[PDB]
Design a protein around this ligand. Structure first.
Ligand SMILES: [Cl-]
Lengths: 328, 322
């Protein structure tokens, strides 16, 4: 199909009659959407679903928010992450089948779903680009979750195929955010991502007078995306991006940071004065795992990212001000 | 190892549930089971037993028959429907097999689910090495996720100390009694039989679409039924096992058509319509694994299998699918 370009000529303008349903809207990424929507006074009725709002795995329960709100746009962020691989497949594929089907049946204009970097093929040449998504099996460790994400992508394409044949205005696409951090992250030191975990380990050292320990050697390099940046990128995707191919949301390779840089940045943001030490008994992760921002950079060249240091200082200030209610 | 030390022996207390059991493959299983006096109560489910896509309806034959073994042959073949109908049915069936303590479950994959870019011969390990062809990729991905779901239920069984094994077979170009003989909608070999019959019955010429040059491996359904039963009794690997004849036994479409003509004693003219285009030349599948594990297996020769299928078709023309 040579017909349409990856972007629309003009952006979609939302009106007050628009209703935007956001599943998984209370996590790190969803709370950032809410922040940007409020800060930039984006029009429309925005509905941020949470766990108490209904079990999206159940087909009938999943129909309830669509019947109630009749959304014109859907941002699908929810995922299930009894820890059995069976559950990871069943719970995610059932919710994904239900959500996308509801989107089609209720005539949602555009639906954006969320994938993650860990669903790409295990055997892969870097940098990761979106076209490589299905080119071989994922890593065995999370392959139930990985395949549900892969079939979430495919189901969107199949629903795009159906919308054409039936003459409906329904578009399905997806974003791939890479290493999000920011307010409302999960700060459990054992179960959280390394960056929010370091923030919690630094805070704990500051309260106890203990040294601040980085579990790696500090050498590996990663690209980190501030959740508020990712939210602006996602809104840009909702307003402009027409392609069914996923789009990576990540910062450039030139902006990669080491764990040691990250941990040092955290220390300065905390103004922690004690010692920061690296535990080399723990083996280092993989050195570089670069993903490619070429498509977004090509399609939105004027986009401005938040400096890493400012994003850490903002994130640390939220953590200090909200420690009691942060997820731990 | 891939094969158990001793074969499973079914008793009169065993109950074997077969989904999709009333087509070509299930009919062959039912035939070998009767011919070889295989024990157990065999239940061949069909549409009348419940919509297996519905999780509750799918539970009914498990609660009713309490199977010890399951052979899962059912499949639905908009792309949306093929993804949803197959993925729900498969999810339901394998979950029921686990929850109800089925000892061994054998599911069925197809040749068309392997990666589009592939080095021939097709071998079982290449199943997930890349995307399938676009034309049927919803059906393909449902089959690939049926394979994965069985491996994942095997992991749960181990972690829980449960005796539930899941595996699968890949039958390649089945033919035989109780096939679909519709000339427009049937597979090449069953369609050709009906075309040859109709040409002999109207006096017309026997017209074969294409040049007759492409080569395929054709497997008699009764052979495949013997291979599947062998797999139930002996095969312990969760890796799928290809069921096909060897590459040396491939036949060309022209060879298929000629054997059919001689089987019907059709004396008129067999012409080739080269205005219709030829499919791919060879799409060869590998039986090395079955050959290594069951080296004494004896196949029905192609001519003998065509003759048996032709006689069944003639004796049961009124009730055959056409
Ligand atoms: Cl991490």
């Amino acid at each position: 199909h040579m017909a349409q370009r990856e972007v629309s000529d003009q952006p979609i303008t939302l009106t007050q009659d628009d209703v935007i349903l956001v599943t998984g809207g209370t996590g790190l990424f969803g709370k950032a959407v809410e922040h940007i929507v409020k800060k930039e006074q984006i029009k429309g009725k925005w509905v941020f679903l949470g766990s108490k709002d209904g079990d999206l795995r159940d087909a009938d329960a999943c129909k309830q928010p669509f019947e109630k709100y009749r959304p014109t746009y859907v941002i699908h962020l929810a995922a299930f992450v009894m820890n059995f691989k069976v559950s990871f497949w069943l719970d995610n594929v059932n919710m994904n089948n239900n959500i996308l089907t509801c989107c089609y049946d209720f005539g949602v204009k555009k639906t954006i779903s969320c994938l993650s970097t860990c669903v790409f093929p295990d055997k892969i040449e870097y940098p990761i680009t979106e076209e490589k998504l299905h080119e071989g099996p994922p890593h065995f460790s999370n392959n139930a979750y990985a395949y549900a994400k892969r079939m979430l992508d495919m189901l969107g394409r199949w629903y795009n195929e159906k919308a054409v044949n039936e003459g409906k205005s329904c578009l399905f696409t997806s974003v791939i955010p890479t290493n999000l951090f920011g307010p409302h992250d999960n700060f459990n030191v054992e179960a959280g991502h390394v960056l929010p975990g370091l923030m919690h380990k630094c805070y704990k050292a500051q309260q106890n007078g203990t040294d601040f320990v980085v579990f790696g050697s500090g050498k590996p390099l990663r690209q980190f995306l501030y959740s508020h940046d990712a939210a602006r990128m996602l809104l840009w995707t909702m307003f402009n991006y027409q392609s069914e191919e996923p789009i990576m949301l990540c910062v450039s390779e030139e902006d990669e940071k080491s764990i040691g840089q990250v941990a040092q940045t955290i220390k300065d943001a905390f103004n922690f004065t004690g010692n920061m030490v690296f535990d080399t008994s723990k083996a280092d992760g993989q050195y570089k795992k670069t993903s490619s921002n070429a498509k977004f950079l090509r399609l939105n060249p004027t986009f401005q990212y938040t400096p890493f240091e400012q994003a850490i200082k903002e994130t640390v200030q939220w953590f200090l001000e909200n420690y009691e209610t942060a997820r731990k």
